[PDB]
């Protein structure tokens, strides 16, 4: 079987996993204890099965501090995960990459790997890893890169896809988050196969505009992220003739080294509070994928060039409707492809429509789409982060915190230089 192991690093990663696994359970008819009473066995790629019929997530949760995973251990999903899958330290990385990578990270790396080995040993054909984390946290940034490096050694010839939280300029968020972001991107670059960025400002804007939550919480955003994650993992968890499995998906979306940062766009995002909602057609949900308001990362794709574009539909969607919707977009939109590329659109269809989370903010829809675009427009998100890094780095502010935690200052310069090269790559592919 084509099994996947999920790794949830730090607060963002762990809390996104709670939302993901709550959704996967509901989507496959699994109770929070792992019991399943209600005909497809494809979900077995994500859940191991006990002899009694308890389905356990093929997931690991790592944090350098206990508070966040302690809520998983005492929460509604306490019986769902095995206690060995939930790993916690004592002292966190204090929003310092060098603590998560060197100093504190080195004290937890070998246990995490052995716990992943116990999961891998229960796989008939481990296909890949899905890694969840923030750019801005010291664990999210530092520990993820250390682990990505070690997974390349232990597995190497196995896919490693990321779901990353791109930092928003919010008053709670650390000052050094632009540093942590550039440092983790540098060290994970040659170790990841794909990275799906989720800009918190974008999700916050969607929650405010579409769900009308003036002050969205992490639960509001994570429930929305987990919908996008579900769309990307749906063909791995469901049978269907119209699926696009992992190697057709990755080979076509992210065919090149380095430039593997697709822009994700999701539609529809409807409020549960709406007294009436006209069901949206394939045309409408596809059209919304070309609207910058529905983007996971804030950038202008109309001003960039595409290398690949994948449409992952779910629900009541017919192949001909998708072709008709694509045709309208070709005549109406500015969908310029790079002049050395296939110019196509990879299309996937899953039969199960989105699942509604009880108490959630999203309304029940018949169809949904997550478009993934390998666009040069993602470099706009890189430039914003790189500018924020540059302002501080010029005066070498906060850098002593890092060098005091097993890091050399040159690692920062080396990191920024690799970002410069990444930004030039997107520019060169655009010409």
């Amino acid at each position: 079987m084509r099994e996947c192991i999920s790794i949830h690093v730090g607060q963002a990663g762990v809390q996104i996993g709670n939302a993901c696994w709550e959704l996967y359970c509901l989507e496959h008819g699994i109770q929070p204890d792992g019991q399943m009473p209600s005909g497809d066995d494809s979900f077995n790629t994500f859940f191991s099965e006990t002899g009694a019929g308890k389905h356990v997530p093929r997931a690991v949760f790592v944090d350098l501090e206990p508070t966040v995973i302690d809520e998983v251990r005492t929460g509604t999903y306490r019986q769902l995960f095995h206690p060995e899958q939930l790993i916690t330290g004592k002292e966190d990385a204090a929003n310092n990459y060098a603590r998560g990578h060197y100093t504190i990270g080195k004290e937890i790396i070998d246990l995490v790997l052995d716990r992943i080995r116990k999961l891998a040993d229960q796989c008939t054909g481990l296909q890949g890893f899905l890694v969840f984390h923030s750019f801005g946290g010291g664990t999210g940034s530092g520990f993820t890169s250390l682990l990505m490096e070690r997974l390349s050694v232990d597995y190497g010839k196995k896919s490693k896809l990321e779901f990353s939280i791109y930092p928003a300029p919010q008053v709670s968020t650390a000052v050094v988050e632009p540093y942590n972001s550039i440092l983790t991107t540098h060290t994970t670059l040659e170790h990841s196969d794909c990275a799906f960025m989720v800009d918190n400002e974008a999700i916050y804007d969607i929650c405010r505009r579409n769900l009308d939550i003036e002050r969205p919480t992490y639960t509001n955003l994570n429930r929305l992220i987990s919908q996008i994650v579900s769309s990307i993992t749906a063909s791995l968890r469901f049978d269907g003739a119209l699926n696009v499995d992992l190697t057709e998906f990755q080979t076509n979306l992210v065919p090149y080294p380095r430039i593997h940062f697709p822009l994700a766009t999701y539609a529809p995002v409807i409020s549960a509070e709406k007294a009436y909602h006209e069901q949206l057609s394939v045309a409408e949900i596809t059209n919304a994928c070309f609207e910058p308001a529905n983007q996971m990362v804030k950038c202008d794709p109309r001003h960039g060039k595409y290398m690949a574009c994948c449409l992952l539909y779910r629900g009541d969607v017919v192949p001909k409707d998708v072709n008709a919707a694509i045709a309208t977009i070709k005549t109406k939109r500015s969908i310029q492809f790079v002049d050395w590329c296939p110019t196509g659109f990879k299309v996937g269809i899953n039969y199960q429509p989105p699942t509604v989370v009880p108490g959630g903010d999203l309304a029940k829809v018949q169809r949904a789409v997550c478009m993934l675009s390998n666009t040069t427009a993602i470099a706009e998100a890189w430039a914003r982060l790189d500018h924020k890094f540059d302002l501080m780095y010029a005066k070498r502010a906060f850098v002593h915190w890092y060098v005091g935690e097993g890091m050399e200052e040159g690692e920062f310069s080396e990191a920024r230089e690799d970002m410069a090269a990444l930004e030039k790559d997107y520019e060169e592919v655009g010409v």
């Binding site: 010839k157 269907g240 003739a241 499995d245 190697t247």
Partner: protein, 217 residues
Amino acid sequence: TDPEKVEMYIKNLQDDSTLVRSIAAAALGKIGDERAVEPLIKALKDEDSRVRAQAAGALGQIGDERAVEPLIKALKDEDPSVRYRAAEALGKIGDERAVEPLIKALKDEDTTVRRIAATALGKIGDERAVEPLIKALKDEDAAVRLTAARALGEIGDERAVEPLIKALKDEDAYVRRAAAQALGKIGGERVRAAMEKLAETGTGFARKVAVNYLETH
């Protein structure tokens, strides 16, 4: 096309940058000059699998028979993405030498390799593929069963008639539709007789199919 770019891209296949190499392999596929065939054949042996996969895809796009044995070798690759691109290319080239190695690919651990190998066999249209694609109609993945039913309709051998009739009673709504479509593609008195017997005994979709077929023949 531009001859100055071709020779630039061919030189870029030996560049130290894995990104420069893979884009160069991809670009030669788009241009499609016969001069890029031997350089791309050497790029199938590259250390980097993203370069190997891009070298495979490009060879399928140019479609020169020289690349048939190099691509057959690439079907044995550690990486499923190289295997996928090699299987796809072989279908585009459409050389019979590729049939038995593609029949082997119908039993691959990777479901995208299986799916693509079946459509490649249907593209070549060789008879040696009929009994293995008939066995591929009993695959765990409905997408592999979809490609196999579709490939059988493309070949048009009547050994596929009765297995396609059972495939109308498939769990997946789209495998059922692809089986009915394949039957129409095959045509002939062998399917008109199968429809006569189905329109009298069969139930559900399978009966609907049969009844409709008779309305026209």
